[PDB]
Amino acid sequence: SELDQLRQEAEQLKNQIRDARKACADATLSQITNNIDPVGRIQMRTRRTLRGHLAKIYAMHWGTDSRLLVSASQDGKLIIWDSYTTNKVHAIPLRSSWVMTCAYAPSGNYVACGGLDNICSIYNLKTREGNVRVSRELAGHTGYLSCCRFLDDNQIVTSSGDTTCALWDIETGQQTTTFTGHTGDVMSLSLAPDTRLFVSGACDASAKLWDVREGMCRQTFTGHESDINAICFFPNGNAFATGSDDATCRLFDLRADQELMTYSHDNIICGITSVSFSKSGRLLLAGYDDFNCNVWDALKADRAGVLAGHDNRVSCLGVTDDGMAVATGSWDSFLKIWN
Amino acid sequence: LSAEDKAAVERSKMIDRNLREDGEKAAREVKLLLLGAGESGKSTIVKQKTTGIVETHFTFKDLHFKMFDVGGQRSERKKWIHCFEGVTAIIFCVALSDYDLVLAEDEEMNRMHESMKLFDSICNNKWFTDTSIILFLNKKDLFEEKIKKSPLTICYPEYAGSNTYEEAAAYIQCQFEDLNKRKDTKEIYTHFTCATDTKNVQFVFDAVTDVIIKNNLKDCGLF
Amino acid sequence: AIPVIITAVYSVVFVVGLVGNSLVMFVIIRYTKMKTATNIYIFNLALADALVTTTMPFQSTVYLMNSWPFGDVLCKIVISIDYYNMFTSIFTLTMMSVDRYIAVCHPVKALDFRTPLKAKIINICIWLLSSSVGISAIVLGGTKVREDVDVIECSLQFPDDDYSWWDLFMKICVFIFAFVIPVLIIIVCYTLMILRLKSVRLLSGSREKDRNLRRITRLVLVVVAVFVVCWTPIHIFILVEALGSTSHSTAALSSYYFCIALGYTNSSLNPILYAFLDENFKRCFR
Amino acid sequence: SIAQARKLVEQLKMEANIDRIKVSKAAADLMAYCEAHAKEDPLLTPVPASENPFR
Ligand SMILES: CC(C)[C@@H](CN1CC[C@@](C)(c2cccc(O)c2)[C@@H](C)C1)NC(=O)[C@H]1Cc2ccc(O)cc2CN1
């Protein structure tokens, strides 16, 4: 009866949490938004189409600046693009052809690579010998890695398939902390701009806030009803929007952890593969399985434009840190840059 | 323009040429999705530390097969099955001798029923509308004496036939073939083999050659 | 009365052939990717038909006026591009059938022998092979009069000399290497392709893959029929008026213009058939 | 097991006793951050040809 008593206590305390966050919502974001000037049509024509991939592209990541992004695809090649000149600087081979995550460090010296091989790959881009060489072979995850966003030059955060997030060290290869509490499988990871916290989404429609210095879940919230596979912070750091496989996008805040705004439309029934913000936070860019990309008013929850033009389903999009341009990757071995 | 920009353009063209000549052989490197139940004869098929997909590189008559054994992937299969659109065939190794025993440690479900559910899941995927399944039935040698004592009534109380080897193999064949819900674009190849039996490479070679004939009709514009 | 209808139908088929070939070239240039080995071949067919459809007003006006005010300025080029079209169409239909046969019967070596680079190499080789005949035609061109009506037509430059044996050897050689070796290769390759498709397991069922094989065989049969039945009576007419002697009979020229009408109708119907039948354009257009 | 239930109930108890303040102020400061940085965003207002180096 002790297990039943503990289950009842957890149920009533979660009910108390739900009642507290229900009474905490004095007003909704719609009735504060509805008296501002709307955003016009974002007729963003393509500028660069980074052709050269021979296989399906799953992930991309920018740097602190533009002009340099990394791209991951199942051809075993991790191409570092020169974005303005459409050129490519390095073509990194992979030991494993199964990749679905990649990242570009803020220092620009290390890149992430992982996938179904259950091993994170870190390569040193700047070496006295002229080549791209792997530095640390990060293993310890029994599931497939799915998101490998970088803290800094020495700390890497990996989202994995064993329903646990992990923070590693480059020089030792061991996990400093193991973030545990996600029941479902995890394929979302986004770090806060102040590099103090991060949120992660999992299959159980749960977005959990974690602290990196001590490693425990500070808040969680369930508003979705399907697999969450796209997460990103608001650029102010006090909110984060969630993209799931539910044909909807939802916005949560770090201060109340409630349903601020949902982004769902009748004409779209396909899932979202990636979601990212611009540096102002007014526009929310949501990828879709409808073979296109769609932008969203992050306050008015209206469609501000469609970046149609992909021959296949998109899988990754990233707006640059200076708000310059978005590079939407897709399954058709293309990577279109929009402005 | 500037000399550094011209050098960068030349390096980009050189590495594009290298990427083209390295990815042109990926079409010749044909690839197979090997999957099956645990200890169901999958370990002995591959003879003819990443803790993930095991890569085996082997060739027969200059074709360079690749097998992706997913035996060490304990995660949810639905979210990583979309990375195998480029696979040409599905190898499904299941054992015929695993019809009576349920787990050999607990009693809640037979191994054959879970294998049938896995085949129905992997055969009716929207990702595999036109990926021909090379079904394999192995370790028939242990099934020869295990059918003399135990009938099919342990596994199926709807058999009502003859408790013999050939009819048992044919009825397992009939259950597995009828799991396919669309027989027009999908064809399921089956081979009978043992743990010490050869001529599996011939069956898989014939399979891959037929699928690439279908591909060659498809790109030329006839199929 | 009599020339009113036939010239109108000729102009109509000329216009529809031009517009069909123009739309085929436009979609293969800017709407359908050109990477498949058969894409460059249907491109070659489009280009050859575009080069030969231009001579249709020339044929119409020479049928009308029974002569031409053209001189040696352009009869030489419109008689060189005739043989250029002939060799191009024949060798592309041969190499397309060879490519299909090596795709079906040898699929393990089709991945190596069906690279786009090798397709371009074979295409340039057959382009040069047609161009040798084209430059031979352009250096053995010219005109002369006939002393019954004093009209003019441009043909091979061979005066009254001991070159008649050479002219018959040239005509018999182009006949053999046009409708013996290429048609024999096309027929043998397609029959062996269907024979290999007998033994496969994904196209020899009973529900829909059997009728898929049936429509594929109907496709190759109708392609061979449209090529042969339309291009062959030309070869009967010219080979009949090569070995012996044939004057300008009224039944001869009527059959001559009938055969020319067929040999232009096939080139007009090739873009429409290869756009509504090749199924890659059907997949792209949807 | 029972240890998993103890861990979950303690983790949820830790998440229970956190500070929660009004959602309307979160909407207000989200709107304030959006309007205060709307000028510094080329995706909102398109920069001219001298700027916008994707040309
Ligand atoms: C392909 C079809 C439609 C026509 C096209 N061709 C195009 C040139 C043409 C209009 C012409 C050219 C020069 C003078 C003249 O009065 C007429 C007239 C001969 C018709 N081709 C021919 O008549 C070809 C057919 C042929 C076949 C075998 C062979 O040994 C030689 C020749 C030469 N004439």
Short mmCIF file of C-alpha atoms and ligand atoms in Angstrom, two decimals, chain C residues 52 55 58-59 62 68 75 78-79 82-83 85-86 152-154 170-171 174-175 231 234-235 238 256 259-260 263-264 267, ligand 1:
data_model
loop_
_atom_site.label_atom_id
_atom_site.label_comp_id
_atom_site.label_asym_id
_atom_site.label_seq_id
_atom_site.Cartn_x
_atom_site.Cartn_y
_atom_site.Cartn_z
CA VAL C 52 14.46 18.57 -89.38
CA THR C 55 12.87 21.87 -93.67
CA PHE C 58 11.09 23.90 -97.82
CA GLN C 59 9.51 20.57 -98.75
CA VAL C 62 9.28 22.68 -103.45
CA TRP C 68 13.38 26.24 -105.39
CA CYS C 75 20.18 23.41 -100.00
CA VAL C 78 19.34 21.25 -95.50
CA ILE C 79 20.68 18.15 -97.25
CA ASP C 82 18.82 15.43 -93.35
CA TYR C 83 21.49 12.74 -93.03
CA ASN C 85 18.84 13.67 -88.47
CA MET C 86 18.72 10.19 -89.99
CA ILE C 152 16.56 21.88 -109.90
CA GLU C 153 17.05 19.75 -106.79
CA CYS C 154 20.08 19.33 -104.52
CA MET C 170 27.22 4.06 -100.63
CA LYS C 171 23.45 3.54 -100.86
CA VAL C 174 23.77 3.24 -95.60
CA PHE C 175 20.81 0.86 -96.07
CA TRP C 231 10.85 5.12 -91.60
CA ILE C 234 11.37 5.64 -97.53
CA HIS C 235 14.15 3.05 -97.67
CA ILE C 238 15.13 5.12 -102.49
CA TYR C 256 7.45 9.81 -102.81
CA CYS C 259 6.64 8.56 -97.86
CA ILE C 260 8.01 12.04 -97.06
CA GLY C 263 8.82 10.40 -92.48
CA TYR C 264 7.83 13.82 -91.19
CA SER C 267 9.24 13.03 -86.27
C1 LIG E 1 13.54 12.32 -93.14
C2 LIG E 1 12.56 12.55 -94.28
C3 LIG E 1 11.37 13.37 -93.80
C4 LIG E 1 13.24 13.21 -95.48
C5 LIG E 1 13.56 14.68 -95.20
N1 LIG E 1 14.06 15.39 -96.35
C6 LIG E 1 14.59 16.69 -95.99
C7 LIG E 1 15.21 17.39 -97.20
C8 LIG E 1 14.23 17.51 -98.37
C9 LIG E 1 13.10 18.47 -97.97
C10 LIG E 1 14.87 18.09 -99.62
C11 LIG E 1 16.23 18.42 -99.69
C12 LIG E 1 16.77 18.95 -100.85
C13 LIG E 1 15.98 19.16 -101.97
C14 LIG E 1 14.63 18.83 -101.92
O1 LIG E 1 13.80 19.01 -102.98
C15 LIG E 1 14.09 18.31 -100.76
C16 LIG E 1 13.66 16.09 -98.68
C17 LIG E 1 14.67 15.13 -99.30
C18 LIG E 1 13.07 15.49 -97.40
N2 LIG E 1 14.45 12.49 -95.83
C19 LIG E 1 14.73 12.03 -97.06
O2 LIG E 1 14.00 12.17 -98.02
C20 LIG E 1 16.05 11.29 -97.18
C21 LIG E 1 15.80 9.80 -96.92
C22 LIG E 1 16.94 8.94 -97.39
C23 LIG E 1 17.01 7.60 -97.02
C24 LIG E 1 18.05 6.79 -97.43
C25 LIG E 1 19.06 7.31 -98.23
O3 LIG E 1 20.10 6.57 -98.66
C26 LIG E 1 19.01 8.65 -98.60
C27 LIG E 1 17.96 9.46 -98.18
C28 LIG E 1 17.92 10.91 -98.60
N3 LIG E 1 16.62 11.53 -98.49
#
